[PDB]
Amino acid sequence: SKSKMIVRTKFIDRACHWTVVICFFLVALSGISFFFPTLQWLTQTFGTPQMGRILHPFFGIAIFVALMFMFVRFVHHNIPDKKDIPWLLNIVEVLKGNEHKVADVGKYNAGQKMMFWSIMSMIFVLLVTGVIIWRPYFAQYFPMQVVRYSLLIHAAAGIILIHAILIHMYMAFWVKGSIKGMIEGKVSRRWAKKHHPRWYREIEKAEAKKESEEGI
Amino acid sequence: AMETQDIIKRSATNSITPPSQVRDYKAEVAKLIDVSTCIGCKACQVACSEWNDIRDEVGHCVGVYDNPADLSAKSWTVMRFSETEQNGKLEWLIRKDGCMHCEDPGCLKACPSAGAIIQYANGIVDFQSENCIGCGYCIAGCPFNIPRLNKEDNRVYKCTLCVDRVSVGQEPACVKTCPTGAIHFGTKKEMLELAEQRVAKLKARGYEHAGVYNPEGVGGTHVMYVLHHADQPELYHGLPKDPKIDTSVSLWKGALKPLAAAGFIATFAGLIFHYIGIGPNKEVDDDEE
Amino acid sequence: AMETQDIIKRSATNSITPPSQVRDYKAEVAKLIDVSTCIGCKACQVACSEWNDIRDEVGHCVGVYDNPADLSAKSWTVMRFSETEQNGKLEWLIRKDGCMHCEDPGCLKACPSAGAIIQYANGIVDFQSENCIGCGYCIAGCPFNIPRLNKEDNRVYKCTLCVDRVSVGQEPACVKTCPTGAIHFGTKKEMLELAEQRVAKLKARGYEHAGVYNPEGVGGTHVMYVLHHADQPELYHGLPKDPKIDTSVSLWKGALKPLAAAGFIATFAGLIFHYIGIGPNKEVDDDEE
């Protein structure tokens, strides 16, 4: 407990995350330009409308690949458990900035875990429906009816994921100190105590204990 | 664009900013294809390509007279052949296939690019290529599987109802060329009249289910057929029975959009009013007092 | 734009999003200027300006028949005169000058504005003025020094090969007017045939180096010449010998772009991953522990 910060995120997972964010900006905006044609400016997300049509799916694939790297590195820390119920029941209290008083928060809270699975499920849905509606490469192999359903679902999934990310960014901006941890990798012990009690308690113990195990 | 000022529908255009359409007092036109008089000569395929300056590849024979085997960016109309005994004796049903120029076009409804597809006051539905992004949404939106992408420029093409001829007073190339007069052209009102007269004659010859194919599900079409067996359109190489814009496409291009719009606006409001109402969540809101 | 759907090349357009060109099955056309039959009457200058609704200024005589002295925004073709004794006796070589309508146009290659210059399937290279920004890059990109800026609207203009006449089936104005038939017009295939027949006749008259000027360096041209002295094109008031797009222009508009693109992307990646990897450089990273 004698250090201003503690490492919350490794460089590799920070590099990935911000790669996903940049790709997502382009993919979400191009997608929105097809969804709401009145927002003409967005048809220039990838330069020209013709270019955007081509690149959207490629950058989409990149996001999926990167999110799968994130999946295998973060999933075990996002597993729902009985300790998450307390959170789910005092949501209104958590949003007022009083979560500590009402819940048991480990590495990532119950909201972050719900977001994680929402994000991971939607990118899978977007991958599958995206491939199906992809011309000229793949749409040809699918029955027209399947292509039609996929067009409906892909649009819906894309919108759901964008809403989710809006909320994910907000929260990140809201629980102050969070963005620095994702850019630099470190969180101050007090930030850990307030927003993620159980989690820091574990690092603190893992820490001290194994250093006490050495035999100072 | 809009030089003709008679554009009644335009793709990806908000309903409160309609396209220029003051010059809309024009009679609707229509092509009537009487399959009972068609001899499957393919003159229409040839005349179409000659007039339109397009040439498909030299294909292969795989056991049937049909060729090319499907519509493509270089073949805007193709004759489809069907041999059947479903009605009691051998029949060779031959049907000219290509854009139906629907009154309520699914291609235009599904298209996400402003102005890529338009509908003229006279009923012609045409592609304005400068605006096409090659997404292919129109292929799925079309109840008749008509649009085809050109690999060489990433744009879709199809029968234009010879808009370049009709616009200045002349009938389409395929219409004029038809050896037996199976294809007719004129105002839709008089083509419907000719169709009913023909149906009456077919009934008098024993075809009790002869009828006009002008599907109400798409608001009627500007390319219609007279069929010996209107009760079984599938017999004519899969012509759809009671075609309509698919329900999934209607929902996707319809209600989903404003719903998503409301969610977005409402979400932005909520988050903004939330931040302002409660304030940031920093490490210590307590030692600030 | 793209209403004709036969645009085979378009300025400042990425190679993976080609212009609309499905209607590309059209014969290439060409103008053949046989300078050995030219009488330097200037009828072509007059017919061109009359047809195109343009008038240059009333200039000055500075000692030669040439007038106007150069192509300009208001003079799309000019006769260039050369007196020489380089071949053993006095000769008056007269050549009609103007756009060559190159198969691989340097103007289009150098142009930075999308759609400002286009090439039609029939070989005509034309300027779409609505998109011209007046940068003048095309003047340097052109191996023949043809484009000219109009001071009154900041746009370039040149011979259009009378695209407005050819598009509807009529030969250019200068072609039709030529008193001696020095100018011919038709499909490029048959113009090449006429050119070779003429070269044969000139050789029979003693011009052993007579030949057709259709430069391979620019992929051939749609305005060609029959020259008495094809071994010395410079004699005809500077006509280039073996013209081609300049190497500096090819590099500038070619490899430099993707190279710069890679640098930019790579730089952005490096800087971003750098900041994240090492973190800020603040006054004390040490008392943070």
Ligand code: HEM
């Ligand atoms: C997982 C990889 C993805 C693939 C293969 C993919 C592919 C596609 C394709 C092929 C289209 C049709 C237009 C075009 O060809 O450009 C499309 C549309 C769209 N995509 Fe994706 N996409 C992917 C990911 C995403 C993601 C992550 C989002 C959300 C940010 C998204 C949102 C959209 C939207 C909103 C549309 C337009 C639907 C409409 O017009 O209503 N896509 N995508």
Ligand code: HEM
């Ligand atoms: C500019 C927008 C974004 C910001 C500011 C942002 C910020 C953050 C921060 C600060 C964290 C870690 C918080 C903590 O340490 O508890 C995080 C985690 C994460 N972010 Fe983002 N993010 C953004 C966009 C995205 C996008 C577009 C995606 C994917 C579609 C994404 C996926 C994730 C995932 C999967 C995690 C791990 C969470 C968990 O394991 O529960 N983020 N983000």
Ligand code: SF4
């Ligand atoms: S030209 Fe007429 S008769 Fe011949 S195949 Fe076409 S529609 Fe039938």
Ligand code: SF4
């Ligand atoms: S037949 Fe298809 S392509 Fe033709 S107008 Fe109807 S929906 Fe559009």
Ligand code: SF4
């Ligand atoms: S492919 Fe079809 S749906 Fe897509 S922009 Fe072109 S016309 Fe519209």
Ligand code: SF4
């Ligand atoms: S109406 Fe014109 S474009 Fe359509 S099939 Fe006939 S000839 Fe071809």
Ligand code: SF4
């Ligand atoms: S009109 Fe013919 S003869 Fe006269 S100057 Fe021009 S090219 Fe020569």
Ligand code: SF4
């Ligand atoms: S002569 Fe010059 S202006 Fe004419 S087509 Fe060739 S490069 Fe372009």
Ligand code: SF4
């Ligand atoms: S001056 Fe020439 S190079 Fe510049 S935009 Fe106009 S046509 Fe293009």
Ligand code: SF4
């Ligand atoms: S072809 Fe037409 S534009 Fe060109 S010089 Fe002749 S008359 Fe003028």
